[PDB]
Amino acid sequence: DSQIQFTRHASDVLLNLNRLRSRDILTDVVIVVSREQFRAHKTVLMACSGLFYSIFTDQLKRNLSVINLDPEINPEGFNILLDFMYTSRLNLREGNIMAVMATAMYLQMEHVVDTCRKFIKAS
Amino acid sequence: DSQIQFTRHASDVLLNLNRLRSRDILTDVVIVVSREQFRAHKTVLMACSGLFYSIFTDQLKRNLSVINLDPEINPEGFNILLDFMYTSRLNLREGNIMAVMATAMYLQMEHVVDTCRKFIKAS
């Protein structure tokens, strides 16, 4: 009938999902990146990453509780991207850009990769 | 270091969460409303509703897979609100406003209740 749009709702949801992550509430996977580990919600990972979408949509892998990433992936770059997934904010710096871009390619995050390219273009 | 804001990210996440709901992927609770049932992600419910937050944050209830709502709750009003949670869009109409408002009070959704009040004020 009469539709009403709430402009802050999606950001408020994402904030609250991040609050749950910070309390480890209903997290259902650990992502292992070399010597570090990061806990998350599979649904958020799938929503933000083609790699995680492809993993958890397969019935064969959906119920995995631990995912080991490629040993070459930089844990800092992963952490930057995980925080982006839950905040919409990307901490890109000359000192991290290459690792973040390579990690975003691996995670299949095309908009982040494109933004990294724009960052390179802007020096 | 250098922070970059992605303005469409939160809405894109929510869209993808709704796509998962529509495929029943990683849904982990059924909400029973009289003769109808609705499947959802607990994390989204907790993010959007004080009632569901209070239920699932308690360790006693966190692992419940079925929640029976009060038998007085209107399934249409619940469905409208569940769709709002996953879309940011509220379908309010003269024919549903009272049931939606009462349901939003029960679900502890203050911004929706306030919007219902504004709808009443605007006739």
Ligand SMILES: Cn1cc(C#CCn2cnc3c(c(/C=C/C(N)=O)cn3CC(=O)Nc3ccncc3Cl)c2=O)cn1
């Ligand atoms: C080498 N290389 C490959 C790539 C790539 C790619 C394509 N690509 C696939 N998938 C994606 C993104 C994405 C956005 C991330 C961002 N902000 O950049 C989020 N996803 C998951 C998704 O679409 N999930 C979904 C779909 C439908 N229904 C339910 C769900 Cl959960 C995404 O960008 C970059 N470099």
Ligand SMILES: Cn1cc(C#CCn2cnc3c(c(/C=C/C(N)=O)cn3CC(=O)Nc3ccncc3Cl)c2=O)cn1
């Ligand atoms: C009788 N009556 C009582 C009320 C009420 C109330 C307060 N109230 C409590 N809770 C809420 C809302 C809310 C917004 C919904 C909307 N769009 O209107 C979302 N929540 C869950 C939440 O804050 N979750 C959360 C918090 C912290 N950390 C993690 C998480 Cl998941 C919320 O409005 C209305 N009528």
